[PDB]
Design a protein around this ligand. Structure first.
Ligand SMILES: Cc1cc2nc3c(=O)[nH]c(=O)nc-3n(C[C@H](O)[C@H](O)[C@H](O)COP(=O)(O)O)c2cc1C
Ligand SMILES: Cc1cc2nc3c(=O)[nH]c(=O)nc-3n(C[C@H](O)[C@H](O)[C@H](O)COP(=O)(O)O)c2cc1C
Ligand SMILES: Cc1cc2nc3c(=O)[nH]c(=O)nc-3n(C[C@H](O)[C@H](O)[C@H](O)COP(=O)(O)O)c2cc1C
Ligand SMILES: Cc1cc2nc3c(=O)[nH]c(=O)nc-3n(C[C@H](O)[C@H](O)[C@H](O)COP(=O)(O)O)c2cc1C
Lengths: 401, 401, 401, 401
C-alpha cells in the first residue's frame, strides 16, 4: 500500500499487462490500475475494490494492511467489475460490513454478485458519513457518468474527491501522483479515455461539474479509480473535462477507410492532399481501419471538426469494419461534426451512399459523397483532390487565406 | 512450370505465405495459388496471369518457358488483380498481343491497368478460337460468378475447363492435382471459399452450370485459378456447387456473440445446452466474434439451418464487431435460414432489439429474442436454457424424439 | 452434468472461447474443455476440478449435482491450474475432505494454493480406494506424463481409466463422446496436442502404456481431462500414442523461415521445387514463422522426417522468431529428424551458420547449409532447387522413382 | 511534389498504412514516408527513390514533375528496398541515366535489381558533382550507418544535407517540415528509430558526425529519407544522435518477461515495488513480451540503466519469445547496461540460469538471479521485493534519498 495523504492509503492494484478493456473495444496500450483506498480515522472506510482478476491478491494485500474485521464501512462508487469485482471474496470474510452506495448500485451490485442479503445503505447527494476526528464523507450522485449507479465520495478536511471513473485514465506507473509521471503519456491516456468512454455523456458532464463546484468544497486531491492521483493543480483534469464536454473539436480532419485493393486508399490520399493545400490550418490524420488502432481513430474523430469515411463496395454493402466503426460512433454521439463518404466500386456501387446515410444516422452533418470506379487514373485523382479542396473550403473554421 | 496434360503447362505462382484476401476479410489460413496456363499447339495461348505482387517473377518465369514474342493470344477470364495483376508488366514486353475477354472485362481490365490501347477481342458464350492441331477454345460468359467480367474457357480434345475462380479454393501445395493432396484440407478450403464468396450468387450458380452441361462438352480436367487442378472425378466439385447453391443447410445451429464481461457468453452456453438436450440431431458451434476466425463463423452459418447472435448493449447500440458481421451477412444473402438475437444489458437494453431487426434485414426469419440483466443467476440461466429448448423445437427439421 | 457411465457424471466445463494456452505458446483454435467427474457409489468421489477461470461456476454447478458435504474423497490426478484451479474455492466449503494425489502433487498443489493444512493422502501405483458396491479406484503414477505430479485413476467394475491430460485434446463440443464428434477435427486436435506437449516425454509413453496394459485391466472408456470421453474403441487413442511415441515421422519435409524482403522466402520456394521434382513421395509444407500458426509448424515438424529452417542475417544474428522457435524445439527434443539451414544475407552473413549450429543443439542431424546474397537471381535459384534435389536424395526413405 | 528549398522538390511517397518493417520486427505505428528529392539547377538530379510498393506511383508522379529524359543524374545514398525499390521501374524508362553511389552500393543495387549493365559511378567522400549555377553535390561515405552502401549527399549553396536513413524517423504527416508537426510524436519516433536500428552502430555515429562537422559546411536543412525535413534548428537531431550514441541511459529500469500462469508476473511486480521504494528516482516500466509492442520494450531498454528479464521454465528451456528477444538484443549490442534474470519453475528450473547466461552473451553486466517455485506466497514475494531493493542499491547512479 501507499500513503495518499495522512490516513488515506492506496490499496489498489497495478495492471501493467492488461490490453483489452470492454471486451476488446478499449485497448489499454499503457496498462491500467484499479485504485482502492483505505481511510483510517476513528472509523475505517474502504473505497471501492479492484478488478475480479485480482480478487485473491486484493483481499490478501488488504489483510496485510488491516485486520479485515476492523473495516467499518465499505463504499462502492461504481459496481462495474473492474472496481467491485473483488467484493464477493471480501464479503465472504466480513459479510456483516455495511455497503454505502447509490440506489442504482444495489441493482448493479446484486446483478453481478447475487448477494442481496448484504447490508446496503442507499446514499443520495449530500448525505454524510462521519468517520471521526472531525472528518466526514460526503456522497455525490453522478448517474450516467458513466453508469446509472455512479457516484463520487468527498472526504472533508483532507479534501480528497474519490471520483472513481471520472477524471481517471488507463495508465500504469509505480508512482502514484500526477506530478510524478510523464505528462505527455498522462494527457494522451486522459483524452483517449474521455473520447472513447465519456463523449456520449458530455451533456451531463458540465451540469454535474457545475453542481459539484457549487458545493464550495475545497479539493486538495482527486483520487480516481484508474491511474494517477491528482494532487498537483488537481483541478486541471476538471477543466479539461469542461473543455472536452463542450462538443470539443480542433481544426482537424480525420480520414479513415477500409480497402481491398488500395483504390479507396488512393482516394483518401488525394483527398488529404486537396485539404492540406487548400487550408493549411487543418491537421489531417489518415487511418486504415483494418491496420490501425481503433481507439486512436475515435480519439482523433473526437478531436476533429469533421471526418471522411471510405469504403469499397463488397456485395452491395460496406466493408464490415466500417459498418462496425459507424455503429460504435452512433453510440458515442459525436456532436457538431461534419462528414463525407467516399470509396471505389467495380460496377453498381451503392456502399458509399449506404455509408453516407449511416454517418448521418450517427449524427454527422453530411457533405456530398465522392465515388470512383476501379483504380483512379490521373483524372480521377484530380477529382479526389478537388473533393478535398471543396471539403476544406466548406469546413473552414474561418475565412481561408 | 508443370505439365497439366499434353501441351498445357502450369505457369502460375504458389503463395504459401498469404493470409489476407479481400483486404483482411478473407483469411487464407492455408495459403493460396494463382493458376496461369500456357497452351502450346499450333498457336500459343496464355490463360490468365497472377497476382500483382508476383508480376516480376511471373514474366521472368514465363520467359523461361517460351519466347514472349511467341505468345499468340492472351485470355483473361477475370480481371481481378489476383489473376490479371501481372498484365501490365507482361504487355509492356509484348504490347501487340491480342487479349480475349468479355465485354465487361474491357471495363475491368482498363479500370485497373489504364491501357485502353491494348488489342481487346470481346468474346461471347459459344465463340471459338482455333489453336491448331484440331483443338479450339470455347468461351462461356459467367457474369456475376463472381464479377461482371467473369468467364470460362474450354479447350476441346484435351477437354479442360479453365474455370478461373469457379470451383477453385485457397489452398497451397507443391502438387497440382486434386488426387495428390489431403482431401480433408481440400474440401474444407473449397467450402470455405464458396460460403464466403459465392453464397450471394447461388441463384446464378445452378442455371449457369445447367447451361454449361447442356453444351455436352466432355470434361477431363477443371483447371481453376486457385488451388488444385481437378483431374480425378473432376465433376465432384461441380456437384458440390450444385448442392451448396441450393440454399444449403445442415441440421446445424451456429451461435456467435461479442461480450465485455462474459454475461452474454453465459447466455450463449445455456442456450446451447437447451438445444443439445432437446434435439440431439443438431450440431452446435459457438464462437466469440472477437476471439474467433470470422471466415469460419460464416462457413458455419452457411452450413446451419439457423443462428443465434448475441450482443451486450454498449451506448444503446450493439457491439461493433457484431454490427460489422451482420453487415457482411446482409451482403452474403443467406437464404432459408432462421435467427434469434440475445444478450445482456445493464439497464435499458435496446441492442438486442436493434440486432434482431438487422438480422431480419439480412434475410433471417426471426424467432423471439432473449434478454437478461447483468450476470444471469441460476433462474436466468434456466430461462436461457429453455430458450434453447424452444428454439430447438421451433427449428427442428423433423419431429423430435 | 452428463452421465458418462452408470454412476459416473461429467461435471466439468466447456471452453468455446479459449485460444491461449501456456501463456500464448499453445493456441486452442477449437477451444477446449476441463473434464471433472463425480462418481456416486457408496462413497462419492470427485475426480479433478476445472480451470481457475470457472471456479465459481464449477462449485455452483457441483452444488446443483450434490450437497458438497456428501463428497467423500477428492482425487487430483494433476495439479496444473487448468484442472486444480477451482480447488481453493471448493476447499473453502469442505476443508476437511481428503485429497488423494501423488507425493509430487502435494508440492504442486501447495505450490499454487498455499493451503498445506488440507488433508493430503499420498498414493502410489497399485494403491486402492474402495468406494463400495464392489468397486474401487486404482491409482497409477505417471510422473513426467507430463508433470512430476501426474497420475491416472482407474475405476474397477465400470472399467473407466481417468487419464487426465494423457490421451486428451483441446476440442470443445456439446457432445461428450468420441463417437459423437467430427473425427478429422478430433484427430487433428489429438496430434496437435501430442506434438506440442508430449513429444519430449515420448521415451516415457511406451513403457508406461506397457506397464498399464500389463495390469490386465479391462478398459471400456478412457475419461481424459480435455475433450471427448473415449468410449467407442477407446484403445484407438492408445495405439496412436504408441505410434506417435516411436520417434514418429512421415515422408514429409517442413520448411519454415522468417524474411524481411522475401529473399529467404524465394530460397524456400526454390528448395521446395527441387524436393518435389526429385522425390514426389515427400509431402512438403512451407511456413513463414511471422505469419503462421506456430503450433501448426511444430505439428508438421513432428510429422516430418526433416526440416529446413531459413533466416536472413540481421545485425549479425538470426531473426528473433527463428531463434525463439529453435529454442522451443530444443525443449521438445524431436528425435531421428534431419535439418538444413539456409537464408539470405547482405554482406558478412553468419546467421545461417549460427542457425545451423543451434539446430544441431536442438537435436537435428544437420545437412549442409544454403546461402545466397541479396535477392537470388536465376543462377542462385538453380542452386536453391539443386539444394532441394540434394536434400531429397539424402533424406529419401526409399531408393526414388 | 513539395518545394523543400529553392529548386529542391520533394517527390517522395507518404505511407499512412505501413505497420510492418524489417518483416515484422519494426512496427511503424505512425506510418512512415519515403523521401525522394528532385533538384532542378542547370543539371537535374534525383536523390533516392521510394519503396518498391509504390514504384508505379513514383514514376508517374515523377513524370508529372519532369520529363524523365531531362533527368541528368541519379544519386542512390542507400540501396535498401524502401528507397531504391522503384529503381528498376525508373531505369526501364531512362536506362542510360548515370547512377552515383558508393562502391558497396553497386553490389547492393545489383543484388536486388540484377541490372549490372546500368551506368554506375562510384563516389568516395569528398567527391563532387557540379549541377550548375555555382552549386555542387558533395558525397560523404557513411558505411555501416547503417549499411555498407550508405552515404550522404550535400548540396552546396542551398546547404542541404541529404542524410537518407540517418536522422530520419518513421512518421507520416501531410506537412513536410519538422516545425509543422507534433513535437512529442516526432521525438518519440526519432528515439524509437535510433534505439531499434542504430544502437549497434553507435561507435560509428560520433566519429562520422565529427568528420562531417570538420568540413565546416553550413547546414540549413537536413533532408532525410524518412519523415520530416529538418529545417528549424536542424542541428537538434544531430545533437540527439550524439547523446544517443554515447551508451545512452537514463535513471530507468525496464522489466519484461513472459509467463504461463502469471507466477513470473507476480515476481516482476514485487521486484518493481522493491525498486520504487528503495530509489524513487528510477523510472520503471514492466512489459509482458507476449502482450506488448516489442519495439517499445527495446526503446525502453535503450533508455534504461539496466533490465530484469523473467521467464518460467518450459521443457527445461526458456519461453521462446524471451529467447527471441534476447537474440535480438545480442545483435543490438547495448552497452554499459546491467541485467538480472528471474522467473518461476515447477521442479528442476534451469531456464533462469540459461537466460542469465544469454543476457551476459548479449552484453549485459549480470547481477544475481532470482528464482521461485510455483506461485510465490507472501514469504517468496518479500524475497522478490528485497531483490528489487538490492538491485536498486547496486544500480544506484547516486549515493539514495
Ligand atoms: C469480393 C468482392 C465483392 C465485390 N462486390 C461489389 C459490388 O457488390 N458492387 C460493386 O460495384 N463492386 C463490387 N466489387 C468491386 C470492388 O468494389 C472494386 O474492386 C473496388 O475498386 C475495390 O476498391 P478498393 O481497392 O478500395 O477495396 C467487389 C469486389 C470484390 C473483391
Ligand atoms: C462502456 C459500457 C457501456 C454500456 N452501455 C449500456 C447501455 O447503453 N445500456 C444498457 O442497458 N447497458 C449498458 N452497459 C451495461 C452492459 O450492457 C452490462 O454490463 C452487460 O451485462 C454486459 O454484458 P456482457 O458481459 O455480455 O458484455 C454498458 C456497459 C459498458 C461497460
Ligand atoms: C536491419 C537490417 C540489418 C541487417 N544486418 C545484416 C548483417 O548484419 N549482415 C548481413 O550480411 N546482412 C545484413 N542485412 C542485410 C540482409 O541480410 C539482406 O538484405 C538480405 O538479403 C535480406 O534477406 P530477407 O529478404 O530474406 O530478409 C541487414 C538488413 C537489415 C534491414
Ligand atoms: C508445458 C509446461 C512445461 C513445463 N516444464 C517445466 C520444466 O521443464 N521444469 C520446471 O521446473 N517446470 C516446468 N514447468 C512448470 C512451470 O515452470 C511452473 O508452472 C511455473 O510456476 C510457471 O511459471 P509462470 O506462471 O510464470 O509461467 C512446465 C509447465 C508447463 C505448463
Amino acid at each position: 500500500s501507499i500513503v495518499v495523504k495522512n490516513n488515506i492509503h492506496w490499496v489498489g492494484q497495478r495492471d501493467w499487462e492488461v490490453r483489452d478493456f470492454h471486451g476488446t473495444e478499449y485497448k489499454t496500450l499503457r496498462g491500467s490500475s484499479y485504485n482502492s483506498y483505505l481511510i483510517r480515522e476513528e472509523k475505517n472506510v474502504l473505497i471501492d475494490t479492484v478488478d475480479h482478476k485480482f480478487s485473491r491478491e486484493f483481499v490478501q494485500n488488504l489483510r496485510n494492511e488491516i485486520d479485515l474485521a476492523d473495516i467499518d464501512y465499505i463504499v462502492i462508487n461504481h459496481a462495474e467489475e473492474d472496481h467491485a469485482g473483488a467484493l464477493t471474496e471480501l464479503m465472504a470474510q466480513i459479510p456483516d460490513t455495511p455497503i454505502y452506495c447509490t440506489a442504482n448500485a444495489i441493482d448493479s451490485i446484486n446483478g453481478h454478485h447475487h448477494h442481496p442479503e448484504w447490508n446496503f445503505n442507499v446514499v443520495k447527494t449530500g448525505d454524510t458519513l462521519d468517520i471521526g476526528n472531525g472528518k466526514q464523507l460526503i456522497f455525490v450522485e453522478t448517474p450516467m457518468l458513466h453508469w446509472p449507479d455512479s457516484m463520487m465520495t468527498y472526504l472533508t478536511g483532507d479534501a480528497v474527491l474519490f471520483s472513481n471513473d471520472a477524471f481517471g485514465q488507463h495508465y500504469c506507473d509505480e508512482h502514484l501522483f500526477n506530478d510524478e509521471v510523464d505528462q505527455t503519456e498522462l494527457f494522451e491516456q486522459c483524452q483517449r479515455y474521455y473520447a472513447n468512454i465519456l463523449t456520449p455523456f458530455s451533456r451531463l458532464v458540465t451540469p454535474k461539474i457545475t453542481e459539484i463546484l457549487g458545493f464550495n468544497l475545497p479539493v486538495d486531491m482527486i483520487a480516481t479509480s484508474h491511474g494517477v492521483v491528482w494532487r498537483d493543480n488537481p483541478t486541471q483534469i476538471v477543466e479539461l473535462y469542461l473543455k472536452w464536454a463542450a462538443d470539443y473539436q480542433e481544426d482537424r480532419i480525420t480520414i479513415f477507410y477500409d480497402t481491398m485493393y488500395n483504390n479507396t486508399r488512393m482516394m483518401a490520399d488525394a483527398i488529404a492532399q486537396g485539404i492540406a493545400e487548400t487550408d493549411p490550418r487543418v491537421a489531417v490524420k489518415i487511418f486504415n481501419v483494418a491496420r490501425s488502432d481503433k481507439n486512436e481513430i475515435l480519439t482523433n474523430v473526437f478531436r476533429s471538426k469533421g471526418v471522411l469515411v471510405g469504403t469499397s463496395t463488397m456485395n452491395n454493402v460496406m466493408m464490415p469494419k466500417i459498418a462496425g466503426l459507424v455503429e460504435e460512433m452512433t453510440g458515442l454521439r459525436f456532436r457538431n461534426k461534419r462528414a463525407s463518404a467516399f470509396g471505389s466500386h467495380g460496377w453498381s456501387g451503392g456502399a458509399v451512399d449506404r455509408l453516407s446515410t449511416r454517418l448521418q444516422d450517427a449524427g454527422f452533418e453530411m457533405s456530398l459523397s465522392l465515388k470512383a470506379k476501379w483504380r483512379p487514373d490521373q483524372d480521377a485523382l484530380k477529382l479526389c483532390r478537388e473533393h478535398g479542396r471543396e471539403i476544406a473550403r466548406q469546413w473552414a473554421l474561418a475565412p481561408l487565406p
